[PDB]
Amino acid sequence: VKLTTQAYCKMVLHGAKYPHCAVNGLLVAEKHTLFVDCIPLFHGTLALAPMLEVALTLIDSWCKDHSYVIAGYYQANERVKDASPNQVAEKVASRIAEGFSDTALIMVDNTPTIHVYEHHENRWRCRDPHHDYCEDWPEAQRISASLLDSRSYETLVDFDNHLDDIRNDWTNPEINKAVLHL
Amino acid sequence: VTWEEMRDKMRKWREENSRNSEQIVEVGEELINEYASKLGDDIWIIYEQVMIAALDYGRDDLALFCLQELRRQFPGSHRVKRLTGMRFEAMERYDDAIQLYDRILQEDPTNTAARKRKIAIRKAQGKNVEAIRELNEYLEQFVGDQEAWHELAELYINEHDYAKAAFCLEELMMTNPHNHLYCQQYAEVKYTQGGLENLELSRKYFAQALKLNNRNMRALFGLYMSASHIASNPKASAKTKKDNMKYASWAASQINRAYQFAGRSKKETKYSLKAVEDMLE
Numbered sequence: 071v072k073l074t075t076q077a078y079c080k081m082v083l084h085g086a087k088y089p090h091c092a093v094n095g096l097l098v099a100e101k102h103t104l105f106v107d108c109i110p111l112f113h114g115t116l117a118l119a120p121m122l123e124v125a126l127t128l129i130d131s132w133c134k135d136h137s138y139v140i141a142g143y144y145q146a147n148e149r150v151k152d153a154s155p156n157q158v159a160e161k162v163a164s165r166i167a168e169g170f171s172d173t174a175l176i177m178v179d180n181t182p183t184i185h186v187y188e189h190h191e192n193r194w195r196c197r198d199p200h201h202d203y204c205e206d207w208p209e210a211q212r213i214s215a216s217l218l219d220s221r222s223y224e225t226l227v228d229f230d231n232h233l234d235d236i237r238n239d240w241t242n243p244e245i246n247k248a249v250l251h252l
Numbered sequence: 253v254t255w256e257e258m259r260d261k262m263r264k265w266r267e268e269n270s271r272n273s274e275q276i277v278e279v280g281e282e283l284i285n286e287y288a289s290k291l292g293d294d295i296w297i298i299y300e301q302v303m304i305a306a307l308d309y310g311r312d313d314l315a316l317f318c319l320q321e322l323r324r325q326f327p328g329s330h331r332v333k334r335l336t337g338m339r340f341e342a343m344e345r346y347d348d349a350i351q352l353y354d355r356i357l358q359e360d361p362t363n364t365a366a367r368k369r370k371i372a373i374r375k376a377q378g379k380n381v382e383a384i385r386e387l388n389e390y391l392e393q394f395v396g397d398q399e400a401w402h403e404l405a406e407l408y409i410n411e412h413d414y415a416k417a418a419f420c421l422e423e424l425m426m427t428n429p430h431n432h433l434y435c436q437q438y439a440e441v442k443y444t445q446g447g448l449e450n451l452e453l454s455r456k457y458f459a460q461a462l463k464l465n466n467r468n469m470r471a472l473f474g475l476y477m478s479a480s481h482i483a484s485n486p487k488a489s490a491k492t493k494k495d496n497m498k499y500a501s502w503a504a505s506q507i508n509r510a511y512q513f514a515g516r517s518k519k520e521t522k523y524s525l526k527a528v529e530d531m532l533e
Contacts, residue, residue: 090271090308117409119444120454124473131530152378157412221274233470236514236523 071174071186071203073097073105076246078210079217080226083245084110085146085178087223092116093146093178095228096129096166101139103172104205108144109240110228116145117158125229126165132241140166144176153179155187155194163194213252222248255287259294266301273308276301281314296322303335307342315339330356334365346373364394380407398427405437414445432465439474448487454478455499469510476503504531 073081077097085093095110111125133139143166145159159175167173167189175194177185186202187194204210217223226245227238258279265276280302288295303318319339322332333356340349350373353366367390374383384407391400401424408417421438428434439457442450455478461471482488483496508528515523 115406115409117412117444118440120440120474120477121470124477127530128527131526135525149376149378224275233473236469236511237517239521 071103072205074107074205075210075213076107076249077105078204079214079249080108080110080242080245081144081178082214083217083223083226084108084113084228086218087226087228088113090148092148093144095144096125096140097142097144097174097176098129098133098138099141100137103141103174105141105174106138107242107246110226112230113228117156121233122162128229129240139170141170141172142166142174142176144178146178146180150180153177153185160194163189213249216252217245217248255283255290258283258287259291262298262301266297271305271308273305276305277309277311277314280305280318284314284318296325300331300335304338307338312339312343315342330360330363330365334369337366337369341369341373341376346377349373364390364397367394368400375407380411383407384411396427398424405441409441414441417441418445430464432461432468432471435461435464436468436471436474439471439478443474443478443481448482448485451478451482451485455482455496459499472503472507472510476500476507479503507531 081093081095084095091113093110094112094116095108097105097108099106109125109129112121116122129140143159143162145155147153147156155175155177159177163173163175173189175187175189177187177196179185179198182198182202184202185196185198187196222245226242227240229240232238232240262276262279262283265272270276280298283291283295283298284302291298299318299322303315303322306312306314306318316339319332319335322329322335326332333352337349337352337356340346340352350370353370356363356366371383371386371390374380374386384404387400387404387407391397391404394400401420405417405420405424408414408420418438418441421434421441425431425434425438435457439454439461442454442457455475458471458474458478461468462475465471479496479499483493483500488496508524508531511527512524515521515525
């Protein structure tokens with residue numbers, strides 16, 4: 071229900087690296103739930119099955135060895151006003167629900183600025199209209215800007231950039247390595 | 253760096269349809285002042301490239317600056333009118349844009365940029381049900397536009413109408429048969445569309461993309477996942493089953509070698525240990 075400064079900073083960095091395009095990834099955690107970090111998957115046209123179902127296994131193979139487990143899924147729509155979840159968000163959340171309970175469907179509202187929908191027997195209903203819980207807002211807002219002003223998103227890499235060149239690390243070592251000292 | 257390199261960079265970022273607006277405007281703002289005299293009639297295409305990029309960057313302090321210097325040199329030009337319409341649309345003024353484009357279409361009825369900006373608003377306003385129809389009409393008028401034929405595929409994929417997106421990707425693959433990306437995206441559409449009647453095409457196309465570009469890895473993963481999906485199908489015959497289990501093994505014998513060379517390139521990190529445990533399943 072809470073996100074770590076690393077998860078939030080990686081989310082905002084991937085969202086800023088491709089503003090014109092959509093943003094998607096998988097929030098993975100340790101095995102009440104805290105989102106330690108996210109693995110950003112793709113951008114642009116996301117309504118495609120094979121590359122999305124490859125990321126499932128190619129991230130599980132890393133998390134099972136790194137003692138991690140995938141907990142949630144975030145999406146950022148192309149438009150700046152529309153933040154309603156598409157069919158893809160539901161179809162991916164239902165897939166992780168069968169392997170890990172308490173799945174959170176995150177919608178990055180471009181114009182806080184984050185919605186969290188939870189499934190309770192009927193649908194996916196958000197909680198941001200009522201209230202959204204985080205560990206500490208000012209710390210995250212400071213450390214995010216600290217990496218934003220330096221234009222560090224140009225250095226960030228996601229799974230789509232990794233499928234182009236394997237020399238790129240989808241786990242973002244050089245990002246959280248700077249996050250720890252800030 | 254010298255201006256003769258900045259010009260080459262601004263030409264390369266224009267040949268390929270890149271959208272790195274920040275890095276484009278950072279170099280354009282210099283060429284507007286620091287090297288305006290070193291290049292002659294090359295400054296107008298740079299103005300057009302910098303205005304549209306600064307619009308994405310959300311900096312109108314340079315958009316209007318590059319727009320007025322184009323309105324002065326080319327008075328009444330149709331490209332500069334399109335730039336003005338795009339600026340209107342970026343400043344949320346969707347009302348004057350339609351009138352400007354109808355005024356443009358009445359002088360030169362063969363104009364197409366106005367026809368495309370007339371659907372750019374519909375994509376921006378969210379009327380994708382209307383945008384797809386207005387784009388299909390334009391395609392019925394101007395066939396062969398290999399940009400609108402891909403925007404239509406994108407709109408159909410976002411609309412989850414995977415059936416008709418294949419009809420556009422085929423029109424794209426007939427004109428660019430040497431482009432592996434058009435094969436990969438068609439293989440993905442066939443994969444997402446249906447089952448055995450479509451996986452049989454997706455497996456072929458994920459392999460044709462590899463044959464056209466042996467450095468493609470998305471096509472390799474697609475071929476592996478499409479061969480496994482036909483191997484694990486109940487309606488699959490024993491012949492198709494064993495051929496698919498051969499294709500999958502042949503693809504996995506190269507996935508690890510690619511990852512082995514990748515892990516060899518990085519003396520610190522070893523990536524071979526990541527994918528191999530997945531290939532044995």
